[PDB]
Write a protein that binds this ligand. Structure first.
Ligand code: 8DG
Ligand code: 8DG
Ligand code: 8DG
Ligand code: 8DG
Ligand code: 8DG
Ligand code: 8DG
Ligand code: ZN
Ligand code: ZN
Ligand code: ZN
Ligand code: ZN
Ligand code: ZN
Ligand code: ZN
Ligand code: ZN
Ligand code: ZN
Lengths: 184, 185, 185, 184, 185, 185, 185, 185, 185, 185
């Protein structure tokens, strides 16, 4: 990402909205905004194999593993405004388990992009599927969208839930229900 | 369009009939304020579903249920012309198309900003979504408090009412319905 | 019509027998206050379901369940003449007819303002709704605390009692009943 | 209040906003609206002496009596939309105490009118002052305003607090603080 | 002490006057149950403070105030003969003497099990503690809900009343009173 | 007025610089959406305090403090152009004039819909109220979360920031300030 | 029955063996207080189910489940003679006969005021109810905290134990047991 | 020290006197378990303050108050030999020396594992800290629930007792004590 | 068992390498404290299940499942040697044998006080219970937070992990497992 | 720079001494993981306040207090090398200069990622802010839980520790300090 070009675009953005890039509080803003966006879009430049590293261990049992409450932050591709919340992951191993923290690294890889909450859930689930080839995986994303809160409809109490169910989580109703019950 | 002038005249007369003084300082601008307020509160009748959606329909990203919960709403009961309000929870399973999240709120407001009965509000919201997306199914749950039950009449204070509408797979598939409802708990 | 004069006489003698002084400043108007209170607390026996509903029956807007929860109630246990209170939750599936929301509260009060047993209260409310709407089904859940268990006798403080009545589809369809009960959680 | 005239005004109101007074759901609406408004404005027609009745008893002590959480419902005189919440009352007797329920009857007398929350607090306090002539009285009104929530600014998390302090509640900082602390 | 036979006869007639049938299966033993209940509910009039304390007064261990909060109480309002209940919080600074913790509850019950006014209940509890022990000060706060305000009359649901009595240093020193009250929040 | 066309051009270029495809289906309308969003998010610069208040200033009804709490707000930090949001609490003591409650919210939005620093937001809101009402004093407390601290950089998740501005009696009278702040707890 | 004198002597020797001074001011009346205490805490062994229930068995008002939850209880573990306490929840479906609500609490106390094992407590309570009402089924859930594992031994602080007993339809019917357990949630 | 054999014999006789069978399966090892239990529960009498604190006295890092709250504790009332438990909160201002955090808990256990009176427990803990650190002042607040008044006697369920001890600046300085107590809120 | 002298030497050097001064007043006894701590934290490797249970296996009292929830645990992740902690919930259906409640906690500590992976911890606890008792089934749920995820690396703050192991009927019958899991919500 | 190679060697030997197998699959990369973790956990010693602040000091917008609360932190106790964590709350009154909000979090981390005692942590954070801004005053409150008290030693579970540092007006002005502390409640 060309930080220098982002800075120039940000400086002009400030002017067009009626601000003064030369005033003290905005002097380093174009630079700060440029670096922030490089970080906020770093997900596009990451590789799944590197993100997981080699933290795949032999399964200790056959029961479902649930990693809940993984906070996430993303940007809606429609308004370029933040949407955030939590991601809950559940899976039944097929001989291999993932290092707990790698789930969060996978979440960040797909969240630090321009997104659609519906896509985010699917991409996370598919990534875990590719890495562990488990019997099944289930991912639930619950978030609040600033594009709905600070502008437009300006609704304050809303939150959205999206999910993706693969393998036995899609095929076995009881398995899915058990996973969702753990989140309640 | 609503005749604001007539509304102002009616409101001015309303004030005198209830025993107030339409001429006192604090009520002078009231007929005007009330007229504008009611035009806004009934603006939903004059809206078009096509314009409300604004073509914000996108290709589905997956096959799982999408649940948009806690969309606050405010309406007026057609029986007493007193506000009833709370939240609307929407759930649906796409059939190739998903809706921009905010459009669910815009649809809610379109049907809430009218004289209503909560049972109908749920149905109309669900039917609007079904028409716009033609999803596999849609479920709408409305939960609200009614001032006509709280500030007068029975004057109950702890009551809330839940109404809903289930279409397609939400009406036919028991487990799909149970799954949607469980997300709300 | 209750004989208020006779109630006052009985209450005045009650004050004497329990050891109090009916002549006290603070007790002078007590017999009169007690008479009026009990006339109100037992007014349910003198009400008619037809008048309580007031013809507030409208055409159904859909086929989904309507749940009116948290209708607070107050009653008197027929065993000790001590209050028991809490909330009544009502669920039903219409068969072409829906009831004005407040009428559920009026029906609750009609049966609550009598001497009762909680098990009966749930049943009578459910049967009343059934008679008025002839719905596909109706379910009533009553949850309350009993002062006769709290301020005397066993003197338990944390206990609460749940009673219910299920009619039509609420009794015949397992999933329907579960759906109603889940809405209460 | 002329219920018949209110009904006629309500029937026309329905027509002007684009509705049909003849449809089933609105048949009895003009009548219902008329009766509701007669009840909602009944406060103007009540008398303080009748509302209190004669429920004024000899004081049992000198300490502050606090009656909190008296729910209330009113109508803003500006938009004719409901504003509601709770009223908390505190006072130090001067030989006379009021029957607890009469505080609620006084609240209703002033709430069932077209109001301004700032006025409501003062009128309730002054009424209690006139009835008991206590050493002091304090009234706090906290409410939510539908004219701010369902229209206009459409803010959802706001609530307003107004109050009135008379006698020792105005003069004695510690007395006022003690009353307000009881509400926390 | 109290004539249970006269109470039973009064209760049996009470059932008749309010519109009930004393012959009903559910009301057969009611007059008897009601008489015994009221005998228990007014037992406080016949209790002696010296016996209530049972000589459970021990030497002080320190100078700091002792706070016994959350002592649940149940009483009857002398105006309507309907229950009012809640909690009693007690704070005191000893002067060489401390009371057995449970004795505070026994004192509460002694005064609560009578016909009362919440303002008096607080004063009588504090005065009793002041008599038994000879503390530097005593503070009693009573917070309760009144059924005469909830199940009839104004029918307000969210209200509760706080009454108190401050003696000795609790009345004298504002900082002591403030500290006692802060412990309750 | 804001040049939407230039904003769209800048946004379109922004998308390509960050590595995205401005031509893909979901991003086609993005430059347009972003342009309109930012014009709205910075609309506060173009508003006039006189028009915002709309002459909704009324005669004071009393002398006590008025507290309008929980007015939600959303702003953009001038340092990172990322949202910071939360609530604004306002307190003031009238000097002959009170403000229409909703105008407090309109004033908040006027200063929040700009590039800001939370410390300034509190001050400007307080100064605006002081100018419009010339009250005895005014206090404004802003509490918010900052996404620039949450979704990047230090990435702290539990932090909230409180800023305030106290004018007149709120700045000078300790007890008046304490009273205002206590209402917020 | 229980030889109080013998218990006092045993308690007196207990005080000296553990290292305390039986002649100390605060311990003089201890052996006496402990004796009466344990007589009360073991009174359940001497009670009779017939007397505890009395004649409080009324005709069933309906066929739906009756749930009496939150009946607090206190018992002593037979293994350490240390208290274990919590709540007992009872559910049952009548077969023509319903029990007076307070009798459930009296039955709980009858089996709780003994040396116990929580697994047994739930079973005995269920059997007692089954014997008295002969209902279609009974379900008992006991949830408590044990001081023997909190104030000594493992010294775990967050643990709670749930034991239960299901008879009749509560053991047979899966849906019935589920419905009962759901009411407790 | 404690003669475990003698306690076992006493516990064995206790079991038969109360009406139980000492030869019963679940009671065979009870007298042994009870003996060791009470030895542990009274171990505080045999501990030495110097050994409990060890050498964990470090140089003060500053002059501000240090507050260690929520230290759970369990003790036995000397009057009934029944447990009373809750939490101990400690606050102090150092005078050049600070204590290792865990030592506060060890001091609490030292005085808690004895036969006690809650008023004394707070005093002893405060004195111990004062003796070990000689700080500018120490404040101790003990809040607990007593089973002797919950599972027997008055059988009150919602009550909690607070006792405290203030030494040095915590007793002298009004603001210091207030600040400490505010931290607990 | 473990060489405390070697651990001390390793810890002393650890302090030096990370940039600290072992000679500092605050670090003088650290190597010693760290060695003893790790000896305690790995004590589970040297424990014997038979001794942990202490023959506390009693005859079953009923057939219903016993649920021991909220057993707090603390462990160290074998990957980073950083603590992970939370609670362990255990459910089982006996087959003539029930375990002493506290023994479940002792089994938890036996396996937690080792280097672990949460997935294994759940399995080992369940297998131990399955060996000691010969139940029809056992279910163990472990829920914990991991410092290696919170204080370093991804630094996520809101996450917690659930692992479990189901044996016997808990694995076989879905309704049994579901009932166990429902008791935890 | 820390010698990661040496840390790995020490960690590998640590695994051997505690009784584990360094050759295990799950422990092969542990020495490397532990080395990197500790380098990060002690990175605070290698940071410079000037670089941490990054010149993010701006002109003050007003004279009122700025409170940044809930900044979560994680540290290692210098006594046992076990984590202690919680939150840091910062308050200050500017003297012409304000700090970028995130810098407070960066300052917290600089001092937290070291071996510490909570009393020192509060002081160093406060002194750092003082040096950077030279404000009229600054106050820092640190509230945390210590694993060395929870997972070993006394094993207390409910305890939490509060430490603080007050400089300038926060130390000199009683009301200012109270105002800051009240914002934290
Ligand atoms: N399904 C879905 N829709 C989203 C997400 N993020 C997001 O902005 N949207 C929707 C919100 C809007 O309805 C839609 C864009 O609507 P639009 O093209 O008419 O633009 P707009 O800004 O004028 O819409 P609006 O927010 O004012 O209603 O994109 C997301 O993650 N999932
Ligand atoms: N089902 C349903 N009923 C409603 C709604 N809003 C609303 O006012 N109602 C009911 C409440 C009342 O029972 C009914 C009108 O009853 P009614 O014609 O006898 O008039 P009323 O004002 O005298 O009745 P009440 O409120 O005093 O009981 O309309 C709604 O959204 N759904
Ligand atoms: N102080 C005070 N103001 C009130 C109360 N009720 C109430 O509506 N107001 C205010 C809200 C509005 O700001 C004001 C009327 O404003 P306005 O004459 O400009 O009319 P408007 O409807 O266009 O105002 P707005 O609500 O859209 O902002 O009356 C109340 O109880 N106290
Ligand atoms: N101060 C005080 N007043 C009480 C208590 N209990 C109690 O009923 N009262 C009041 C409530 C009533 O206002 C009053 C009796 O009022 P009243 O003689 O007019 O009788 P009422 O039944 O018609 O009054 P109301 O409840 O319908 O308002 O007694 C109490 O403990 N303290
Ligand atoms: N006082 C104050 N500071 C603010 C506000 N909004 C906001 O971003 N800041 C601070 C956060 C940062 O510390 C600072 C910008 O720091 P900087 O110029 O070093 O830029 P940076 O992005 O590299 O800083 P950082 O967030 O990564 O720590 O602006 C606000 O409303 N008030
Ligand atoms: N499944 C599972 N994984 C665990 C546990 N404890 C624990 O540290 N892990 C994982 C977290 C990490 O992803 C993994 C070690 O990852 P790694 O070998 O790449 O080392 P790292 O420190 O660089 O990884 P990271 O935490 O920075 O992501 O071990 C546990 O109890 N269960
Ligand atoms: Zn968007
Ligand atoms: Zn209505
Ligand atoms: Zn208004
Ligand atoms: Zn009364
Ligand atoms: Zn920023
Ligand atoms: Zn035990
Ligand atoms: Zn005792
Ligand atoms: Zn780890």
């Amino acid at each position: 990402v060309d930080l220098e070009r982002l800075q120039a675009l940000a400086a002009e953005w400030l002017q067009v909205i009626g601000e003064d890039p030369g005033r003290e509080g905005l002097l380093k803003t174009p630079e700060r905004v440029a670096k922030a966006w490089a970080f906020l879009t770093r997900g596009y430049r990451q590789r799944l194999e590197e993100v997981v590293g080699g933290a795949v261990f032999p399964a200790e049992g056959s029961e479902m593993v649930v990693v809940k409450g993984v906070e996430f932050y993303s940007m809606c591709e429609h308004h370029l405004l933040p949407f955030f919340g939590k991601v809950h992951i559940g899976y039944i191993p097929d001989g291999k388990i993932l290092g707990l923290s790698k789930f969060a690294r996978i979440v960040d890889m797909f969240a630090r992009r321009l997104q659609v909450q519906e896509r985010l859930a699917v991409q996370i689930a598919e990534a875990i599927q590719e890495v562990l080839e488990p019997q099944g995986v289930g991912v639930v994303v619950e978030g609040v969208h600033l594009c709905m809160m600070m502008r437009g409809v300006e609704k304050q109490h809303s939150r959205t839930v999206t999910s993706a169910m693969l393998g036995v989580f899609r095929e076995n109703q009881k398995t899915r229900e058990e996973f969702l019950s753990h989140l309640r």
